[PDB]
Design a binder for these strands. Structure first.
Ligand code: ZN
Length: 647
RNA sequence: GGACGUACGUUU
RNA sequence: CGACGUACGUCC
């Protein structure tokens, strides 16, 4: 409630009436700077005129937090504060909200959708655009699209009452720059994309930030992996047998994906599996039934190989028993789907191998040395200080649960309590305040950024465990980049204003140039009637003449004959988006297919099965080729809009 | 469902 | 120096 020199020096360049790239690591500091700038902006206007400051929050939690803070602050001043979110902008006059409010905190995607539709034609209605975590303004972000619209309206020659573009962040960032030249070039490009000539950074009151800055210390621990990999050897033999028995129907399986040699349990092998799957999903045997059987068998074999590769990665990273548990869970989930010859062979082979796999996994001599040293350093820190709440960063959503199960089943430790955030001593998270003075990045590659919210100094460690010193060197150069970016900011604060502005202007110019150069024309709409087939079944789903478009993004089918071609399933997490209500999922209605086709929702009153071309193959009736797309934007055809007059 | 970003990996 | 695959996170 009382502004200090630290909170005032960052806002001093912003009160003069110029854009800024204010960089404050303190979470409370950013909110206080927001409030002070908003007060000084709405108070400096004379009678008759009024501000329309807009705050762009990226996430819903920080959005609601800023909304509550602004509504609690600007109450006695006589200012109307509101909010527009994803669950609040449904059939609501956003134009009337903007015209009757002054401190709207609408998220950026809402403003992008409004600019695309036609509501709020010019941004000149606003007067002060305060972004949150502005360093995301890089490419195709909602922030970047709002800035593209602003720069277009500015350089177009109709620059009216343009709003201020004061941005707030914690780290300006470097990206892929190598030397100070490319670092300064990237920072200048960001400053031009956000249209500012000042970067507010503390230089005279560094002690106020050093008091609470949350600067931890790194303790990189390069450790080795297992040696006697009996589990990995058995899984590799199983995968070799599976590939050998799968090559009986496709003699040219090796000629479909030509990259390099492949090894089981690698991301390269996973990519090769996905590529050979997408290559075997386009077969054109004229039988149309044996072809479907061969495609289904190849899809099942490839899915089994992918699951085995995922199990090998889980065995390499987390405990050995967790990989066997994941394989048993996958086999139990596929057992309750269908029983054909392919499943009756694969599941029976896995059951034959499980009698040895369980005996190998239950051996205490095959424990991961990475998990061993992890529990070692954990118990070390815990008996050194028994009041250290920790956070453990994991890469995979399966490993973040495997480590929780390991901690729950580890006899060497009992004080730990799993606090998974995909009565809580350890918080095993995957990707992200004022607490948790211990971080353990377990094979997870800035990603430990905690200086965006509330923080506290006086004790913080940033242990990093890994198996490849590569990653170590990576983090090293990362710290290097941190330093160099600091230096670059210093240089910018040493630069003059006018020339700087001129430079950034030229930058924006070139940018717009590139933009107008990268403007694809309308795709030539195909006039033929191509049909879509299932991925793992190759069954006739629907013709492109019965496909309708809702909002240039969603695709449905109006064919009543299609209504019996799928089955419904209760959605694991129903939620609303824009104008839809996610009610259920639609899967393939075949013997043992159960392929994920799409999602059954309700648009306004009508029930529609919104499908995804990703889970579809395109076969033309004129030519005969079977092309395979990923996104609807890549599929070019007669995109007929959704006409509610028909159904 | 669609868009966006990040990380890893493969390639002309 | 562009596309591609995966994982993660966000948004509408
Ligand atoms: Zn099917």
């Amino acid at each position: 409630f009382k502004p200090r020199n630290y909170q005032l020096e960052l806002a001093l360049p912003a009160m003069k009436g110029k854009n800024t790239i204010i960089c404050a690591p303190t979470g409370c500091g950013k909110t206080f700077v927001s409030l002070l700038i908003c007060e000084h902006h709405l108070k400096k206007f004379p009678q008759g005129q009024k501000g329309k400051v807009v705050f762009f929050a990226n996430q819903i939690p920080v959005y609601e937090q800023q909304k509550s803070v602004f509504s609690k602050y600007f109450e006695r001043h006589g200012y109307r504060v509101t909010g527009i979110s994803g669950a609040t902008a449904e059939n609501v006059p956003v134009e009337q909200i903007v015209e009757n409010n002054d401190i709207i905190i609408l998220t950026p995607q809402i403003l992008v959708n409004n600019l695309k539709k036609g509501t709020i034609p010019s941004l000149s209605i606003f007067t002060l655009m305060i972004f949150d975590e502005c360093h995301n303004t890089s490419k195709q972000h909602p922030y970047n699209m709002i800035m593209f619209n602003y720069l277009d309206q500015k350089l177009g020659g109709s620059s009216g009452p343009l709003p201020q573009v004061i941005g707030l962040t914690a780290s300006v960032g470097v990206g892929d720059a190598k030397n100070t030249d490319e670092a300064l070039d990237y920072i200048c490009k960001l400053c031009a994309s956000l249209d500012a000539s000042v970067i507010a950074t503390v230089k005279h009151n560094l002690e106020e930030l050093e008091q609470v800055v949350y600067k931890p210390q790194k303790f990189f621990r390069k450790v080795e992996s297992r040696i006697s990999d009996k589990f990995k050897y058995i899984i590799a033999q199983l995968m070799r047998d599976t590939e050998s028995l799968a090559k009986r129907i496709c003699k040219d399986l090796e000629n479909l994906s030509q990259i390099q040699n492949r090894e089981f349990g690698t991301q390269k092998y996973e990519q090769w599996i996905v590529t050979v799957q997408k290559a075997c999903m386009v077969f054109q045997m004229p039988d149309k039934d044996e072809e479907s059987r061969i495609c289904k068998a190849l899809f099942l074999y490839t899915s089994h190989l992918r699951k085995y590769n995922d199990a090998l990665i889980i065995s390499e990273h987390a405990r050995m028993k967790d990989a066997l548990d994941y394989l048993k869970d996958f086999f139990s989930n596929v057992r309750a789907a269908g029983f054909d010859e392919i499943e009756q062979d694969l599941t029976q082979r896995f059951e034959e191998k499980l009698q040895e796999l369980e005996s190998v996994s239950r051996d205490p001599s095959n424990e991961n040395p990475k998990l061993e040293d992890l529990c070692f350093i954990l118990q070390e820190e815990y008996h050194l200080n028994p009041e250290t709440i920790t956070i453990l960063f994991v890469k995979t959503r399966a490993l973040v649960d495997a480590l929780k199960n390991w901690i729950e089943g580890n006899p060497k430790l009992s004080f730990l309590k799993p606090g998974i955030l995909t009565d809580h001593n350890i918080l095993i998270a995957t990707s992200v305040i004022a607490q948790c003075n211990l971080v353990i990045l377990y094979e997870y590659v800035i990603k430990m950024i905690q200086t965006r919210g509330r923080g506290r100094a006086r004790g913080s460690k940033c242990f990093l465990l890994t198996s490849n010193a590569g990653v170590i060197e990576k983090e090293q150069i990362n710290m290097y980049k941190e330093k160099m970016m600091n230096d670059s900011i210093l240089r910018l604060q040493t630069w003059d204003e006018a020339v700087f502005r001129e430079k950034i202007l030229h930058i924006q110019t070139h940018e717009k140039f590139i933009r107008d150069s990268q403007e694809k024309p309308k795709p030539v709409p195909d006039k033929e009637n191509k049909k879509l087939l299932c991925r793992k079944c190759k069954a006739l789903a629907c013709y492109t003449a019965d496909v309708r478009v809702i909002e240039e993004c969603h695709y449905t089918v109006l064919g009543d004959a299609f209504k019996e071609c799928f089955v419904s399933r209760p959605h694991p997490k129903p939620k609303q988006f824009s104008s839809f209500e996610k009610r259920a999922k639609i899967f393939c209605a075949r013997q043992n297919c159960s392929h994920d086709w799409g999602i059954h929702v309700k648009y306004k009153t009508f029930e529609i099965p919104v499908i995804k071309i990703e889970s579809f193959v395109v076969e033309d009736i004129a030519t005969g080729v079977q092309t395979l797309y990923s996104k609807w934007k890549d599929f070019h055809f007669e995109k007929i809009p959704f006409d509610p007059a028909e159904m």
